């Protein structure tokens, strides 16, 4: 067919739209109905299109992704599991991005130099493991994973998996890009079929066009408020309608990115002329030309069925700001000043932060510079502190060149390194004390308790970068940029003009400094060294195989009340230092979860000593004494980040099962991957029948089967017992992971030894 390479770094890896077409056509002959766009790309990547059972929301699809991307806070454990498999080389194009371990303190170059000294052991491990197993390496300073992917790797029709829940960002260039845990990435790098529960499809029809202060970010802030954080679970969100051509390609990536906050499997836009334009401006005109020839397979079929349809008229959409502790609490910017006042949320904004993968594009930076130049023209600078994170080295070099970085410095901003930084709590924040109630506003995406600065009382609101800039200049939530007046230096009141800026550079992008390191695919004689006394890295010891017995008289480690995110189960911020060291990071296990017994975080009753203490310590005490334990959770357990450490840590400290009213998708898969039993109540009211003092027996593991519930005997201390049923979503592939002790143990059994 055409021999068009998948990226500039892999000249020999060709795009296979011929394969996609062939597979779409086998499947539509079977289904005889219109296919949505997500169905075309997902069913087009089936391992066996002729025999795969395809029912939305019910069957597990065996898929073949085109490539794997990893960022350095999850790559360490994905590669330590890959190193246990014993396989010599990755089977598909794979990259590591070093973006999560650079702490914001001094700004830009200074923080990057310091991170390279501090994290030398880890950057060394990842570069060497990358060279040995054939994984491309983007050096510290290169940029945030998802901006590097949109710029270099995402193309229409790709199926890409990434070990980061915001990998959906690539849906802005028409690909299916899905967040997974490190063990799922190992399947694909190992060459075995990846499984995904067949998604439902929510369609969002966009009408009208964006005007003025409304930006692409307001579309997904509104959609999150509508669907809530659990409304997208098990579905792909597919944007369509006449309003789509109104949105820039990075704008589409912003909307797909934050669909992670409603729990969606991913989000996608149809191939169109804005994407074509972006591909051509990023050196990939040949890929846009090939996608023009396969265009029919890159847009939805006429008359396809969505399981839910939502319509948003872009012309009536107004600026939004969401939070403070969930991203689906949505307020128009016009009313947040008055809701804050009523709810006792701090009105004064201490810090305004723009960037992150969600909103660090050239257009985002130009729109923020457009607000800032107006303030400068009246002799004002920011009242709040103001930070700017460029998404990649190319964007930093180009906004520097086109003058936007200097405008942002002149209003009072500090340009941080091209890294997550304050977004995952890598921020040496010193302006407030811990426990001090305060407000920050960001153009990020999640705003969960203590995530940006480890202070549980920081109230963080997420909005668009131009609204963060406008509010940073005013310094208060009681300021609506559309209606209110500022007072210049000269004494005149003035109003901010709605920002307008170019979506892409008129000239070409300036690539900035060299940061990609290609694997030697010759040599590969790298020894990966992990010192046995390292505090940051530790080789894995395999978990135990199942003993063949039912789980009786399980102790409840903690019955959690309410929202329990993976930042509650395994915090980030300072704990990122231990992401390659399982025993050391297990000391944060569940320290953020609220215990229903006393309403406290990190205080559970040790059943033997009758002392209340830290959750990690209690779990290690139970494990020392052979007491097997369980966690009882509420709705949407495991919401958020994909970090598989929230599943590896309970397995390591002797946990056996997590029984909840419902699970978020990626955490439930990670639990099964590590040999734990994620189970849900067949009747969610049974959560109220279990008290922290009860012992539980899970029976029926011997005839464990897809679709058959397990019986749980609740043993009350007074001698009463109650039997309840627990459902599970295991298929026979997954039951084999459980019986072997973990998916990696099963994979190693299949290696004939
Ligand atoms: O490295 C991580 O902890 C996983 C992240 C970053 C985050 O929480 O934003 C994710 O999957 O989203
Ligand atoms: S959401 Fe924040 S922490 Fe996660 S990849 Fe994006 S910039 Fe990094």
From Swiss-Prot:
Primary residence: mitochondrion
Under the heading Pfam families, the entry gives:
Aconitase, Aconitase_C
SUPFAM superfamilies, per database record: Aconitase iron-sulfur domain (SSF53732), LeuD/IlvD-like (SSF52016)
Q: Which residues form the signal peptide?
A: none
Q: Which InterPro entries match?
A: Acnase/IPM_dHydase_lsu_aba_1/3, Acoase/IPM_deHydtase_lsu_aba, Aconitase/3IPM_dehydase_swvl, Aconitase/IPM_isomerase, Aconitase_4Fe-4S_BS, Aconitase_4Fe-4S_dom, Aconitase_dom2, Aconitase_mito-like
**How is the cofactor bound, as the UniProt entry phrases it?**
Binds 1 [4Fe-4S] cluster per subunit. Binding of a [3Fe-4S] cluster leads to an inactive enzyme.
Phosphoserine PTM sites in chain numbering: 531, 642
Q: In which pathway does it act?
A: Carbohydrate metabolism; tricarboxylic acid cycle; isocitrate from oxaloacetate: step 2/2
Query: Does this UniProt record's set of keywords contain Kinase?
Result: no
Q: How is it modified after translation?
A: Forms covalent cross-links mediated by transglutaminase TGM2, between a glutamine and the epsilon-amino group of a lysine residue, forming homopolymers and heteropolymers.
Query: Which parts of the sequence carry N6-acetyllysine?
Result: 22, 110, 116, 205, 489, 495, 545, 577, 695, 702, 708, 715
Record-annotated residues binding [4Fe-4S] cluster?
Answer: 357, 420, 423
Per its record, the protein catalyses:
citrate = D-threo-isocitrate
Which top EC class is named for this enzyme in its record?
A: lyase
- What protein family is recorded? Belongs to the aconitase/IPM isomerase family.
Q: What name appears for this protein in its UniProt entry?
A: Aconitate hydratase, mitochondrial
